[PDB]
């Protein structure tokens, strides 16, 4: 048993909800919240900017120190950093950004990072302002992640479309 509530059941291990992921993280304080990061960990907008804002910019301060030491991530890669006031850990995962012209095939590699964690609260990688079709991202998630993933979809109208079209 875990503390996630009101999620629809898509598969044995994938659950989904219409929620603001920042507000969800605050309530649950999950072991792992996934950030939809870029390779520079520059948390300007989207999930990244919103989580970062909720940490009072402490996520960005930590991230800049990480990059100064380690250099950028790979598209498809990840790093584990603090979850600050939102979660124990934040898994920063870089999905391909279609609006930057990155290869959507890398989405599966991005979701494979989730398998290193038993339970996660996460967004649909590469969707939203990253430019991919959320229906596709959800399909790749279900077909790649084997650990227990609790997906938050910010937009109610898209959430209903994702549920109604899910095979």
Q: Kindly state the smallest distance separating residue 27's Cβ from ligand WQO, in Å.
A: 13
125 near 91, Cβ under 8 Å? Answer: no
36 near 123, Cβ under 8 Å? Answer: yes
CA 133 – CA 127 distance, rounded (Å):
6
Q: Kindly state the smallest distance separating residue 11's Cβ from ligand WQO, in Å.
A: 19
Q: Which residue is nearest to ligand WQO (CB)?
A: 128
Work out whether 160 is an interface residue with ligand WQO (CB under 6 A). Answer: no
Of residues 23-52, those binding ligand WQO (CB under 6 A): 36, 46-47, 50
Of all residues in the chain, what percent are helix, strand and coil, respectively (each to 5)? 40, 20, 40
CA 9 – CA 124 distance, rounded (Å):
16
Q: Kindly state the smallest distance separating residue 65's Cβ from ligand WQO, in Å.
A: 23
Give the nearer residue to ligand WQO in terms of CB position, either 36 or 81.
36
What is residue 156's three-state secondary structure? helix
Question: Of the candidates 16, 21, 34, 145, which one interacts with ligand WQO according to CB under 6 A?
Answer: 21
For 46, left (φ over 0), alpha (ψ -120 to 50), or beta?
left
What mask of x and - would describe binding to ligand WQO in positions 90 to 129, judged by CB under 6 A? Answer: ---------------------------------xx--xxx
Q: Determine the length of the chain.
A: 167
What is the helix (H) or strand (E) element at residue 158, kind and residue range? helix 156-164
Give the nearer residue to ligand WQO in terms of CB position, either 76 or 128.
128
Interacting residues toward ligand WQO by CB under 6 A: 20-22, 36, 46-47, 50, 123-124, 127-130, 153-155
């Amino acid at each position: 048993v875990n503390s996630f509530s009101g999620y629809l059941k898509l598969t044995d291990n994938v659950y989904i909800k219409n929620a603001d992921i920042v507000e969800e993280a605050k309530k649950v304080k999950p072991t792992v919240v996934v950030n939809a990061a870029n390779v520079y960990l520059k948390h300007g907008g989207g999930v990244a900017g919103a989580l970062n804002k909720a940490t009072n910019n402490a996520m960005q301060v930590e991230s800049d120190d990480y990059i100064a030491t380690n250099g950028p991530l790979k598209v498809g890669g990840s790093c584990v950093l603090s979850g600050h006031n939102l979660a124990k850990h934040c898994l920063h995962v870089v999905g391909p950004n279609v609006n930057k012209g990155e290869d959507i095939q890398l989405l599966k590699s991005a979701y494979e990072n989730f398998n290193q964690h038993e339970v996660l609260l996460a967004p649909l990688l590469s969707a939203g302002i990253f430019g991919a079709d959320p229906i596709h991202s959800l399909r790749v998630c279900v077909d790649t992640v084997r650990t227990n993933v609790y997906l938050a979809v910010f937009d109610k109208n898209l959430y209903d479309k994702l549920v109604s079209s899910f095979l």
